Design a protein around this ligand. Sequence first.
Ligand code: MG
Length: 122
Amino acid sequence: HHMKKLQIAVGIIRNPQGEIFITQKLEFPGGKIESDETPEQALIRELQEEVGITVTTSSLFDKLEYQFPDRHITLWFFLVESWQGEPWGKEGQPGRWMAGPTLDPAAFPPANEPVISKLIAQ
Ligand SMILES: [Mg+2]
């Protein structure tokens, strides 16, 4: 019965050519925000772990809040256009640069849909 609460920080890593580093059901890298840290602190750690980059500067792109009967999920999406390192599948997972204007929202989990829609415009 106790309703779980989960918060996640995810990185939209975009190079100057407008490509986004997408890992794989495609997803943005990122993970759980621990209870003692900001969304961006979790973003920095998770992106270091998952794709081996150190986030230099970020900006909040969107914040989505999903209510389910058993849980409440918050997804913080950060635009990352400055970083140190070269993204790769550091956790043994696929990763590649995809042109922003061509992302398929149906190829991502539907929780990402409002963010994918906005990326295609930009
Ligand atoms: Mg993780």
